[PDB]
């Protein structure tokens, strides 16, 4: 039962329990082997186990399609280290090594338990006979498609080779199919389900966006006589939630330009919020000192471009403020999400200005056209624009900010708990929008 999974989880993978109860649910569902499955969890969160552990228990071969060799290699190497009968088929292999593997799979009892293949080979006429014999001889326990989103033109990583995978899934009729990715909008999820020919009911395990402890709000810079003061007050309120620790935690302010970073750090510092600018314009030495002081809590606020990265994670970020609207909802989600990792209350705020909206909308269109002269027209170009439009919608609409985010990503309506501006005071937001409408001209 569940017992076999736990033991094989320890006896092979050396783990007491699954990272999450969701990862557990996903794995168990793949184990039952009745349903096609879709896993949309982030990088980390242990998606691989969701198909690897069940691949072992299966009494047959698991094929795994992955788009490039780096991804394949990481795991095969690690599966070997667990004394697990894994193999890779790719054209970066010698013709004889290939011939040898193909022969293995043709044998009544093949060595291979897990075969990683590229989409190219999986479609190739040179591999269909092998695949046919595995199907005929009922030796195939799972078809797995990693980076499933690559099938979608509305995705950011489209690969025509992935379109052929659908016809293939149909051929491997009996056997369950598992599709995995870190990132799919509802439109991408639809393209995956359809283009991979997943058999309904498709069982879905998707890590929710929602974070209780983050308080989201938007302010309109055009409706504010002291913007710098508004920001100061915001940073101070976010810091010093515990008079016991005095001024407690740290904060990020994001700006589009390096000039804005420099200038805004001054405005804040002068008003009594100690802030230093971080951008690629600074000398390496300067950057390492600013980062250090922020990390070591000598300087509570960093004013940064997108150059500040998930590479540095800090638990006690009490606020992220976007002085300028982000290029994309996914960017805003990622950037604002640097807040509150320790679980304690934090504040995410976006400073919206139609002058900003237009400045960015222009910048995107200009560097999309720069691509169209180089590579020509593409469906990804339209998704780039759609990605920004979602965030403009997020600002200029009224409704739970967390729900708007859940909707974009394809999550359930989340449990807001007066945890965004709109849910706390729907009226103020209405008033503020109305106000921006008068200030429209």
């Amino acid at each position, epitope marked *: 039962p569940e017992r076999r999974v736990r033991s094989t989880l320890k006896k092979v993978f050396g783990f007491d329990s699954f990272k999450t*109860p*969701l990862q557990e*649910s996903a794995t168990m569902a793949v184990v039952k082997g009745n349903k096609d499955v*879709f896993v*949309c*969890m982030p990088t980390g969160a242990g998606k691989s186990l969701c198909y690897q552990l069940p691949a072992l228990l299966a009494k047959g071969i698991t094929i795994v399609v992955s788009p490039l060799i780096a991804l394949i290699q990481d795991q095969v190497d690690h599966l070997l280290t667990l004394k697990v009968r894994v193999s890779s088929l790719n054209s970066k292999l010698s013709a004889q090594e290939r011939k040898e593997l193909l022969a293995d799979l043709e044998r009544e009892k093949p060595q291979t338990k897990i075969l990683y293949i590229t989409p190219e080979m999986a479609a190739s006429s040179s591999f269909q006979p092998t695949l046919n014999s595995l199907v005929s001889r009922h030796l195939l326990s799972y078809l797995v498609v990693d980076e499933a989103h690559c099938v979608s033109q509305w995705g950011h990583d489209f690969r025509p080779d992935y379109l052929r995978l659908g016809a293939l899934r149909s051929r491997l009729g009996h056997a369950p199919c598992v599709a995995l990715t870190a990132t799919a909008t*509802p439109q991408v*999820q*639809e393209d995956v*389900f359809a283009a991979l020919h*997943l058999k*309904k*009911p*498709v*069982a*879905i*395990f*998707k*890590t*929710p966006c*929602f974070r209780a402890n983050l308080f989201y709000d938007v302010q309109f810079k055009e409706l504010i006589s002291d913007p710098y003061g508004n920001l100061k007050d915001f940073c101070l309120k976010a810091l010093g939630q515990e008079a016991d620790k005095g001024l407690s935690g740290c904060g990020i302010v994001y700006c589009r330009t390096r000039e804005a970073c420099e200038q805004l750090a001054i405005e804040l510092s002068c008003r009594g919020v100690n802030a230093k600018a971080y951008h690629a314009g600074l000398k390496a030495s300067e950057r390492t000192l600013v980062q250090n002081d922020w990390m070591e809590e000598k300087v509570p606020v960093i004013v940064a471009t997108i150059s500040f990265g998930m590479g540095v994670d800090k638990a006690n970020v009490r606020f992220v403020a976007h002085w300028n609207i982000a290029k994309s909802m996914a960017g805003y989600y990622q950037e604002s999400g640097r807040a509150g990792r320790d679980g304690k209350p934090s504040w995410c705020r976006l400073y919206y200005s139609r002058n900003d909206r237009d400045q960015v909308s222009f910048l995107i269109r200009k560097e999309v056209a720069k691509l169209q002269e180089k590579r020509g027209n593409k469906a990804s170009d339209k998704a780039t624009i759609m990605a920004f439009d979602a965030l403009v919608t997020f600002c200029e609409e009224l409704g739970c900010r967390h729900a708007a985010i859940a909707k974009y990503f*394809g*999550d*359930a*309506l*989340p*449990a807001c708990a007066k945890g965004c501006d709109h849910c706390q005071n729907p009226t103020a937001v209405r008033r503020r929008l109305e106000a921006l409408e008068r200030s429209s001209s």
Partner: nanobody
Amino acid sequence: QVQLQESGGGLVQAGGSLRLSCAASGSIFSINRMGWYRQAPGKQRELVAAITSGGSTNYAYSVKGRFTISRDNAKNTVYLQMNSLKPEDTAIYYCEAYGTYTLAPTGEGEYDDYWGQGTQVTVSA
């Protein structure tokens, strides 16, 4: 899993008007297409009309101009306004919630088609 209830099917005079309302309930994030199918007795089931998320409609030739499909995306409800009914329109009418995306506040979801039990429409001349 989802609950579809069709309603508003009844015996009608020739030239009568019938409205068929089906409500989809569950943790429904979205429905690709809500559609009305009908099955006359000892005849094979046929598409009467369907409407996508986005409002693209699609109708059988014989009901074009007499029948109007419409949807309330937020209530997950589809309607079929049947006008100028004929005896040939007599059948059991089924509603198909096609591509129905379900999701808990945990990441646990499903994607499936759902069908109703059907509602009898009889048209007397």
